[PDB]
Amino acid sequence: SMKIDVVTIFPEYLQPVRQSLPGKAIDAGLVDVAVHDLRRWTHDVHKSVDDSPYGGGPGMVMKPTVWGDALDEICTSETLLVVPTPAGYPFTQETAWQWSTEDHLVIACGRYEGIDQRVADDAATRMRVREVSIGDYVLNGGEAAALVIIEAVLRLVPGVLSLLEGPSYTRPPSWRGMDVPPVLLSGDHAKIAAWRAEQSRQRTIERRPDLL
């Protein structure tokens, strides 16, 4: 049973997640994903969520007072607050496994230059906070990262949704001049396992030498 709350100024971006969820898992009370428009917690008629950065620089910073009110309402002491950020700790499969047994994830999606740091720092005094990055590239905001995190985590929750994997093949045995490796059709399953292991070793050397 996991609850995920996502807070964002672009609620529509999280539409795929809602679609990804099988009815059986929702009906069994195994998972609930709710998406919240950050502007519900704005203070002014202009529904302001950002303001100029102290110390100067380009871009804007999301307002602490708005985020503070949102997280005050949504989070409890048991919440794991997830904050995507290009400056975060790396989100890995190990992370996904750890988070898959949490009762309550709240994902705070920023835009612009990010969220005033006091939001996370204040929250960390009353709950667990994790600033994470999904990879070494730059996005426009946290929403695509939330999609990735939600999928990676929920597929590890029962019935909700190292070396590199080698190539896979299926029918037909010959296609556009290319035959499936004959070893795979040999019925020698110890040999097939060794062939697959060597394919994986070769691919890891070529594509991810860092893993070795």
* Known binding positions for adenine: 134-135, 137, 139
- Residue span 96-115 as binding mask against its own copies, x where in contact by CB under 8 A, dash where not: x----------------xxx
CB of 20 to ligand JEB, least distance (A): 13
Q: Enumerate the known binding-site residues.
A: 84, 110, 133-139
Phi–psi pair at 46, nearest 5 degrees: -90, 0
Asked whether the beta carbons of 35 and 150 are under 8 A apart, the reply is: no
φ, ψ for residue 7 (rounded to 5)?
-115, 130
Print the binding letters for residues 68-97 with ligand JEB: x by CB under 6 A, - otherwise.
----------------xxx-x---------
- Residue 138 near ligand JEB by CB under 6 A: yes
Q: Based on the shown chain and the rule CB under 8 A, indicate whether residue 129 belongs to the binding site for its own copies.
A: no
Q: Decide: is 1 part of the binding site for its own copies (CB under 8 A).
A: no
> Is residue 141 close enough to count as binding ligand JEB by CB under 6 A?
yes
Nearer to ligand JEB, 60 or 192 (CB): 60
Contacts for 64 with CB less than 8 Å, ≥ 6 apart: 115, 116, 118, 119, 122
Q: Does 137 bind ligand JEB (CB under 6 A)?
A: yes
Placement of tokens 């994997």 in the chain: 165
- Residue type at 167? P
**Do 100 and 147 form a contact (C-beta atoms < 8 A)?**
no
Peptide bond into 86 cis (omega under 30): no
Task: Name the DSSP class of 171.
Answer: S
Using CB under 6 A as the binding rule, whether residue 64 contacts ligand JEB is answered as no
Choice between 140 and 186, CB closer to ligand JEB: 140
CA distance 151 to 9: 20
- Tell me: does residue 66 bind its own copies (CB under 8 A): no
* β-pair partners for 50: 62
Q: In this complex, which beta carbon is closest to ligand JEB, that of residue 49 or of residue 188?
A: 49
Instruction: Give the footprint of its own copies on residues 164-193 (CB under 8 A).
Output: 164-173, 175-176, 178, 180-181, 183-185, 189, 192
